[PDB]
Design a protein around this ligand. Structure first.
Ligand SMILES: O=c1ccn([C@H]2C[C@H](O)[C@@H](COP(=O)(O)OP(=O)(O)O)O2)c(=O)[nH]1
Ligand SMILES: O=c1ccn([C@H]2C[C@H](O)[C@@H](COP(=O)(O)OP(=O)(O)O)O2)c(=O)[nH]1
Ligand SMILES: O=c1ccn([C@H]2C[C@H](O)[C@@H](COP(=O)(O)OP(=O)(O)O)O2)c(=O)[nH]1
Ligand SMILES: [Sr+2]
Ligand SMILES: [Sr+2]
Ligand SMILES: [Sr+2]
Lengths: 118, 118, 118
C-alpha cells in the first residue's frame, strides 16, 4: 500500500513488482560519471515500510547502475535517482523513458531483542 | 513459497536467504565489461511476490557486480544474470560454480491510497 | 525484530529503514579499488529473515558502492562491508562516520511447490 504524487511515475500492472520512474529531460551520462536525476515523485508508505528504487533490465544491460535507492518512511521530499555508468559506452537517456523502478517493501528493523547466548 | 525448474539452481539450507545459481560454462569477464549469463532456471511465485537475483560474498569481493536482478511475478522466461566487472582484474567464472543467489520476497507495490495532507 | 551487538552500529529512528554502520578507522579508497571494511557488529534474526547491508545517499552520491550485503540467518560472525569506488575521485572515509546501513527483511525462499503447467 502507498500514496504517491508526481508525473514521473507510471501506473503499473499487478504482476510487475515496481512502478516505472520516467526520465525528466534528455541527458547523457559519460563512462564512469555519476548523475543525480531529479524526479517530482513523492510517496507516503505505512509504518515499517520503505521504497526501494532499483534497476530495469533494459538499462542494466547497458551498464546503468542505480545506487543508494532506499526511501525511508519519514522522507517527505521528492525522490532523487542516483545513476552511475559502469559500462564502456556513453549512455543517453531520452526524455520520458523508463530508467528505474520503485518497489514498496516492509522491513523489520525495530524491536531490538536480548541476545541469545545459546 | 515458490516453484522452480532448471539445473542451474541448487537446493538451499533453511538458514540461508537465497538459492545459489550456477554458471553454465567457463567464461572470462574483462575489467569493465558486462556479460549477460543465461540460466535455464524458471520460477513461479505467489501473487505480490518477486524474485531478487543478487550477489554472493565470494564473487562481490572480487569485483563481480550483479545488476538489474528483479524477477517479476508475471515473467515466464528463463532468468538471465546481468554481470559487470567493476574490479581491477579480469574475472574468470568456472563451469558449475555459484555466482549469484535468488531470494524470494513479497512486495506491497499495489493498492494506491489517497494522499494524506496532514 | 533482531538482536545485535557491537560498537559500529548506531540506534536508529523508527521512521528510517535501517541502522547506520560506522567506519572503524580512517581509510582512503582509490578509484576502482575494492576494500573489505570490518565491523564488530553481530546480529541474530528470526527464522526466514536476513540482514541487508546497502548504501546511504550521501556516500552513493560520491560513487561508493556497497556490494554483496546479504547477511544470512545462520551467519554467526561479524558483518564485513564490501566497498568499491565506482566514482572518478578517491574517496576518504573518516573514522566514526556512517558509510552503509543494515535493513532487516523477511524472505520466502523455502517451501518449494509443484510447478503449475496451467
Ligand atoms: O537514491 C536515493 C536515496 C535516498 N533518497 C532520499 C530518501 C531518503 O530517505 C533520504 C535520505 O537522506 P539522508 O538521511 O540525508 O542521507 P543518508 O542516506 O546519507 O543518511 O534521501 C533519494 O531520494 N534517492
Ligand atoms: O537481471 C534480470 C532482470 C530482469 N530479468 C527478467 C525478469 C523480468 O521480469 C524481466 C523484465 O524484462 P522487461 O520488462 O522487458 O524489461 P524492463 O525491466 O527494462 O522493463 O526480465 C532477468 O531475467 N534478469
Ligand atoms: O557483504 C557481505 C556479504 C556476506 N557477508 C557474510 C554474511 C553471509 O551469511 C556470509 C556468507 O559467506 P559464504 O557463505 O562463505 O559466501 P558466499 O556468499 O560466497 O556463498 O558472509 C558479510 O559479512 N558481508
Ligand atoms: Sr517491465
Ligand atoms: Sr553461502
Ligand atoms: Sr539518514
Amino acid at each position: 500500500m502507498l500514496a504517491y504524487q508526481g508525473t514521473q511515475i507510471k501506473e503499473k500492472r499487478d504482476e510487475d513488482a515496481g512502478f516505472d520512474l520516467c526520465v525528466p529531460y534528455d541527458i547523457m551520462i559519460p563512462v564512469s560519471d555519476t548523475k543525480i536525476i531529479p524526479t517530482d515523485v513523492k510517496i507516503q508508505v505505512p509504518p515499517n515500510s520503505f521504497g526501494w528504487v532499483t534497476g530495469k533490465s533494459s538499462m542494466a544491460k547497458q551498464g546503468l547502475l542505480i545506487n543508494g535507492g532506499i526511501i525511508d518512511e519519514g522522507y517527505t521530499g521528492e525522490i532523487q535517482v542516483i545513476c552511475t555508468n559502469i559500462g564502456k559506452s556513453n549512455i543517453k537517456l531520452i526524455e520520458g523513458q523508463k530508467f528505474a523502478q520503485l518497489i514498496i517493501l516492509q522491513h523489520h528493523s525495530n524491536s531490538r531483542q536480548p541476545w541469545d547466548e545459546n
